[PDB]
Amino acid sequence: MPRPRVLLLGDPARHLDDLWSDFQQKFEVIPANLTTHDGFKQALREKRYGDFEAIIKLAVENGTESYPWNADIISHLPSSLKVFAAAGAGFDWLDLDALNERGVAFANSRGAGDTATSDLALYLILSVFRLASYSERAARTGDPETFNRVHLEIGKSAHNPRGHVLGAVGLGAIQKEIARKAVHGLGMKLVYYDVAPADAETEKALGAERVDSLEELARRSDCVSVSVPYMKLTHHLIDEAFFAAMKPGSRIVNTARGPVISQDALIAALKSGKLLSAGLDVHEFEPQVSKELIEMKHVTLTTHIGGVAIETFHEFERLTMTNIDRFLLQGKPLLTPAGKVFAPS
Amino acid sequence: MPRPRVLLLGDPARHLDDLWSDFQQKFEVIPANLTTHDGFKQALREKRYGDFEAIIKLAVENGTESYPWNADLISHLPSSLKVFAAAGAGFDWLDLDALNERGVAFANSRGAGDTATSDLALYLILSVFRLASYSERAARTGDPETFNRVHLEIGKSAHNPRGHVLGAVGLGAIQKEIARKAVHGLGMKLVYYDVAPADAETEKALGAERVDSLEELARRSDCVSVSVPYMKLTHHLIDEAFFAAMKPGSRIVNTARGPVISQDALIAALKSGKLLSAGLDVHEFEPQVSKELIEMKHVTLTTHIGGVAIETFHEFERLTMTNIDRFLLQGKPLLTPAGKVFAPSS
Ligand SMILES: NC(=O)c1ccc[n+]([C@@H]2O[C@H](COP(=O)([O-])OP(=O)(O)OC[C@H]3O[C@@H](n4cnc5c(N)ncnc54)[C@H](O)[C@@H]3O)[C@@H](O)[C@H]2O)c1
Numbered sequence: 001m002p003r004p005r006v007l008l009l010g011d012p013a014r015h016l017d018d019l020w021s022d023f024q025q026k027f028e029v030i031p032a033n034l035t036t037h038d039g040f041k042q043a044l045r046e047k048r049y050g051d052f053e054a055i056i057k058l059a060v061e062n063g064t065e066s067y068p069w070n071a072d073i074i075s076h077l078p079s080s081l082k083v084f085a086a087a088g089a090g091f092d093w094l095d096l097d098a099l100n101e102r103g104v105a106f107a108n109s110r111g112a113g114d115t116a117t118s119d120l121a122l123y124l125i126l127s128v129f130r131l132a133s134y135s136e137r138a139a140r141t142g143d144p145e146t147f148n149r150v151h152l153e154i155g156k157s158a159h160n161p162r163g164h165v166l167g168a169v170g171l172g173a174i175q176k177e178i179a180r181k182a183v184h185g186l187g188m189k190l191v192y193y194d195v196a197p198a199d200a201e202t203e204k205a206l207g208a209e210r211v212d213s214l215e216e217l218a219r220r221s222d223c224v225s226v227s228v229p230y231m232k233l234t235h236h237l238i239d240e241a242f243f244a245a246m247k248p249g250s251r252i253v254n255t256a257r258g259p260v261i262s263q264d265a266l267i268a269a270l271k272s273g274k275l276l277s278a279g280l281d282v283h284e285f286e287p288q289v290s291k292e293l294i295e296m297k298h299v300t301l302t303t304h305i306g307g308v309a310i311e312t313f314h315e316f317e318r319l320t321m322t323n324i325d326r327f328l329l330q331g332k333p334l335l336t337p338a339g340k341v342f343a344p345s
Numbered sequence: 346m347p348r349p350r351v352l353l354l355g356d357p358a359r360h361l362d363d364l365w366s367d368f369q370q371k372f373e374v375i376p377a378n379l380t381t382h383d384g385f386k387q388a389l390r391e392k393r394y395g396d397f398e399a400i401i402k403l404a405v406e407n408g409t410e411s412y413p414w415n416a417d418l419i420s421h422l423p424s425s426l427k428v429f430a431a432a433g434a435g436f437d438w439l440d441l442d443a444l445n446e447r448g449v450a451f452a453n454s455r456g457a458g459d460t461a462t463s464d465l466a467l468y469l470i471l472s473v474f475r476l477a478s479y480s481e482r483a484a485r486t487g488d489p490e491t492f493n494r495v496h497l498e499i500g501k502s503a504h505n506p507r508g509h510v511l512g513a514v515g516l517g518a519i520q521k522e523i524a525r526k527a528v529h530g531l532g533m534k535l536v537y538y539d540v541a542p543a544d545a546e547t548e549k550a551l552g553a554e555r556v557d558s559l560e561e562l563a564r565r566s567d568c569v570s571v572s573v574p575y576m577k578l579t580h581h582l583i584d585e586a587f588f589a590a591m592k593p594g595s596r597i598v599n600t601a602r603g604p605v606i607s608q609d610a611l612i613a614a615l616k617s618g619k620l621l622s623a624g625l626d627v628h629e630f631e632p633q634v635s636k637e638l639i640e641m642k643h644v645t646l647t648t649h650i651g652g653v654a655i656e657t658f659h660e661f662e663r664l665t666m667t668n669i670d671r672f673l674l675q676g677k678p679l680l681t682p683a684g685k686v687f688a689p690s691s
């Protein structure tokens with residue numbers, strides 16, 4: 001045959017050394033040498049990499065200089081192309097429909113960051129219940145008076161998560177782990193809203209109580225956990241109507257996608273006292289954090305580290321290489337497909 | 346006749362109003378109206394409050410005008426005193442042995458903050474596996490480039506706690522809640538080191554594996570959880586020798602007391618890169634936090650907020666009031682004695 005040709009966007013592997021060596025056994029890996037989005041579309045128009053059968057993206061932050069993967073750039077891929085495999089769950093940067101129209105199969109890396117992301121979210125919930133963020137800022141002043149004033153100030157407002165209600169917006173895979181840790185580890189109760197209902201087992205295992213609308217979920221919650229896929233339909237899913245329905249002095253955390261929560265609404269609900277504290281690992285104008293949120297006492301903000309753990313990367317690398325391996329050499333279907341499903345070689 | 350007499354040290358109840366009503370009700374509650382220490386010694390000499398049978402202290406910061414509770418002060422108490430129940434875990438301000446020399450039973454508020462303090466440690470554990478503290482500071486620059494560079498920089502070292510080893514120094518009530526949360530919550534593994542063994546029912550539940558020395562525990566640990574009482578025995582317990590025996594790139598969290606861990610041995614270990622990260626709620630020179638620790642990217646620091654939750658203080662009041670009711674009206678022993686245990690009355 002003998003060696004199908006894989007285009008690699010950005011870096012080679014950093015963790016699964018043996019598996020990456022076997023992968024290079026097995027396929028001719030062509031480095032993309034990315035410069036500009038435009039430079040890469042020029043490259044594709046000039047047949048610079050030749051015909052190639054697969055594209056591999058080994059990390060979320062790898063290959064970004066090729067973005068966006070819109071119709072226009074996709075119109076230039078060689079027709080030999082069979083499969084594109086990418087790290088990550090989100091593929092906001094990718095027109096999956098333009099890619100499927102060319103008979104190209106897509107695979108993401110769904111599942112790899114579950115443990116990671118659910119942990120960060122557990123960290124956020126801890127943080128907004130105990131006001132730990134404000135606490136750390138005080139400690140880091142290195143000032144004796146501040147340390148004491150704050151240690152006392154926090155005591156008027158901090159609460160154990162235990163017996164308080166976590167309102168899950170979405171009850172997908174990462175929210176199931178989040179829940180299980182809040183319910184069984186921290187002792188919170190669960191109500192959730194979701195497009196579809198959890199099975200008998202998940203509900204009876206987490207004590208999940210479903211409700212019909214977001215407003216209902218808001219009404220019932222002491223802290224809300226947003227964990228939904230991001231799309232047009234989820235943009236500003238969390239807005240003014242939602243904060244108006246929440247209880248005075250409640251809490252919210254986001255590990256899903258920034259613009260799923262209206263930053264302006266959020267800011268307004270903290271200023272008014274509707275929310276006591278909020279925790280964001282994602283930001284509507286990412287990489288720009290809200291200057292107003294920072295400026296506030298009780299808002300925990302992190303640099304999108306939800307899935308950022310070495311084990312997650314181990315899995316991004318495993319799954320991308322395994323998918324291509326399966327789909328081109330083994331005649332097996334993709335392990336983590338997304339969009340239209342094609343036949344293996 | 347009915348109603349034993351209780352001296353109230355400082356302010357009345359602030360959270361459990363209805364319990365405080367029934368208490369008051371059951372007992373003649375006499376406010377100390379404290380002025381100063383000597384002032385309280387003199388009220389006691391003059392018999393200002395008459396005989397009483399209990400003292401109740403409802404918040405850690407109440408009645409501090411009476412400190413110290415030294416032998417000279419204790420020696421003027423009415424011979425009718427049988428019990429003193431207090432808010433707090435610590436009692437540095439009290440000479441316990443002297444109180445006991447006078448047949449007075451003592452009770453603190455052990456366990457009141459088991460939920461609070463275990464949760465705060467779990468938080469810190471999350472913080473030192475994931476370098477979240479670093480990430481927080483990075484976010485608050487509000488500089489887009491910092492955001493991305495730190496996003497990427499954390500990826501070089503952050504790890505799931507899942508499958509890694511939590512080494513419990515001390516396995517009392519707080520650690521057991523920490524292990525529980527770390528083990529079945531996070532999927533961590535647990536080895537421990539404690540002057541007392543823990544029973545089948547516990548070790549089987551937490552999958553707990555006991556070792557015999559600090560040096561051992563340091564070697565088997567991916568993350569060290571320090572949670573021991575602070576005394577003579579435990580001063581500087583975690584020292585240069587301990588950090589010497591710890592796996593390269595390991596981590597440590599303290600929720601116990603400041604000096605249980607040598608601040609200088611800690612700084613060194615962090616500087617050598619023997620430690621990746623560490624999380625301190627309590628500080629050697631509290632309330633002064635290490636200014637070296639502060640400048641380090643990978644050190645999480647909080648203002649002693651372990652037990653600082655509204656529920657903890659709800660429970661200080663529950664226990665102090667319930668302790669005196671059992672001991673004096675229900676013929677039952679204290680729930681949380683500390684020091685010599687004495688027989689009740691009804
Ligand atoms: N913080 C991070 O670094 C990080 C990392 C990875 C993923 N995430 C986020 O997690 C979120 C999704 O969770 P997942 O992918 O782990 O599990 P999943 O794929 O199973 O999530 C989808 C779940 O949400 C429900 N859902 C689908 N569409 C919805 C909508 N329109 N409105 C409300 N609910 C809907 C579905 O029933 C399903 O249960 C995504 O937003 C994703 O971007 C965050």
Ligand SMILES: NC(=O)c1ccc[n+]([C@@H]2O[C@H](COP(=O)([O-])OP(=O)(O)OC[C@H]3O[C@@H](n4cnc5c(N)ncnc54)[C@H](O)[C@@H]3O)[C@@H](O)[C@H]2O)c1
Pocket residue numbers: 434456458462514515516517518519520538539540541572573574575578579600601602626627649650651652653
């Ligand atoms: N950060 C906070 O706000 C805060 C709040 C509550 C408790 N604490 C701390 O928790 C610690 C006590 O833990 P606890 O409340 O679970 O009480 P505990 O008595 O149950 O904990 C002590 C445990 O350690 C063991 N032990 C005692 N001395 C030891 C030693 N010298 N070496 C090794 N093991 C020893 C005991 O068997 C016991 O199991 C104290 O330092 C206390 O200050 C801090």
